[PDB]
């Protein structure tokens, strides 16, 4: 509770920013990979 | 009265498993009538097990859920192995299976009459997992205000298959029921796989803590409510399956996937507006609940000291089970990217049903030794014994079937026995441990912004 005083310190939040930014970049990149797989996939010859 | 409890049980045991099981059930059964018999017997066994767990919950009265039952009757080691397998096999594989189904159903509208290029299934599945896990780690209030909507969609999804099935049945286009119990051989070896597929529709009977204080009149409310709930859910599931069989032939189901969208195509007109989206949302609902349950699991495991206390840890403010999602997400990624729905289901089912049967088998031992615990409800002798014997015997027979898939689960559940050295050891000699763990545990606690609940 009161023992996480070092979390509210400069640099530590920088590590959190970096980790979350890398996670979000990976998520957007893999979603874009899914999108390009779908788009470049064949378009279902019409019946 | 008891209506609210019945509603809770109904909403906790429906799940998305009814949209995954029928394909596998038919695949390893090869006969419509035998498949329906499999559904009925799985429902009966689920009712028996639910009664057994009701008796267990009433006879112990100690919080903890699945942990307490196994720990109390057997000892520390089976409980440790149970948590080990639940963390390493059961939860990640079940989540991966549900997520693969959700991804296939959400990609079906875009691929109307085609094949989804496998890899896109995994990517959309993983994206859904990531968004669900961050939503669970975002807030708990908004993760519950949406749970009611997901449950309502779950109720809506079953009607979309039930009512048109009723219309087809009343009009009597049932030409596949002329010889219900004949077809492909599908020798007895595949019966454990059929059985495994059978339960997963009834996923949610376990967990579901029933403390003997919420009910009005206990020891009659819990058994009656659970019996009616299993009865009506089994009736709904068998009606859903026969509705599926009204339009979808056995061959048209065997050489196909995502049976719901095939049913919609073969029966309804405009379909992508209703069936795929509703079933994808139904599969989305099961995603939210599991994270909270597995996070809760760690809370009781910290008292005995079987897992590091950081796993039952919580955020300072914006209270979410953050540390329990970062240890479960990568495992789910591993299973979904290195597993198949046919194999992951067996991988999870072998361990989960071995341990559930072992837990229920403790009822025979508990009732034979020291029969004085003020048992509120006395489940008869034959129910827990039959459930445990059938589960253990057929799980053991499942080793012969697809051995390369359950072998990993077996060696992991045997890995827990050596893994007890993390709990007993002479001197850890912190040159290669303890001190490194102290840096690691502190680093994770600082990075993830976690403080204990009230300890
Ligand atoms: N409840 C999940 C299974 C995972 C779990 O046991 O929490 C389901 O309906 O498939």
Residue numbers in the entry:
A (entry chain A): 168 to 214
B (entry chain B): 45 to 499
What did the article's authors report about this structure?
The heavy chain 4F2hc is a single transmembrane spanning glycoprotein (also called CD98hc or SLC3A2)17,18 necessary for correctly trafficking the transporter to the plasma membrane. The light subunit of human xc− transporter, xCT, (SLC7A11), consists of 12 transmembrane helices (TMs), which adopt the canonical APC superfamily fold, wherein TM1-TM5 are related to TM6-TM10 by a pseudo two-fold symmetry axis located in the plane of the membrane.
Strikingly, the repositioning of Arg135 appears to induce a structural transition of TM8 from an unwound state in the apo structure, to helical in the glutamate bound complex. The structural changes in TM8 observed upon ligand binding suggest an additional mechanism for ligand specificity within this transporter and are consistent with previous observations of an allosteric mechanism in the LAT1 homologue BasC22. Starting from our structure of the glutamate bound inward open state (i) we propose that ligand binding causes the allosteric transition in TM8, which facilitates glutamate recognition and closure of the intracellular gate, via the packing of TM1A and 6B against TM8.
